[PDB]
Amino acid sequence: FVCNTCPEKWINFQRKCYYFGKGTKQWVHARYACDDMEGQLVSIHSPEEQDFLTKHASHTGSWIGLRDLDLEGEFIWVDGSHVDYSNWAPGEPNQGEDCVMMRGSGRWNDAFCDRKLGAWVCDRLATCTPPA
């Protein structure tokens, strides 16, 4: 009936859980690190979710789960969803910079995928209160 339960070290927002990771990672590195924790690099689909992420975002930049896929020819989230909501920094995005990071402001920019960032965000679904 109510789905806000999250694992230790994760934080709940709405029906999801979020992990604010710290450590030096390239984009595909953060992707696999989230997968190792049974999550995914975060996907962002509303201003309310973004505002939550901004409150907890690292000041020096974080990888998020968005990258430009060559065959589809567009930015696609790690879970296969399309970009409906976006929070690009003004002028962004602008060949080579295929991966997407989130600044301390919450705003996004594209970047070389081998850039090393000190933070990254995973998400997963929250679990739910049981039957009595």
Author numbering: 158 to 251, 255 to 292
Publication passage describing the model:
Immunoglobulin E (IgE) is a central regulatory and triggering molecule of allergic immune responses. IgE’s interaction with CD23 modulates both IgE production and functional activities.CD23 is a noncanonical immunoglobulin receptor, unrelated to receptors of other antibody isotypes. Human CD23 is a calcium‐dependent (C‐type) lectin‐like domain that has apparently lost its carbohydrate‐binding capability. The calcium‐binding site classically required for carbohydrate binding in C‐type lectins is absent in human CD23 but is present in the murine molecule.
To determine whether the absence of this calcium‐binding site affects the structure and function of human CD23, CD23 mutant proteins with increasingly “murine‐like” sequences were generated. Restoration of the calcium‐binding site was confirmed by NMR spectroscopy, and structures of mutant human CD23 proteins were determined by X‐ray crystallography, although no electron density for calcium was observed. This study offers insights into the evolutionary differences between murine and human CD23 and some of the functional differences between CD23 in different species.
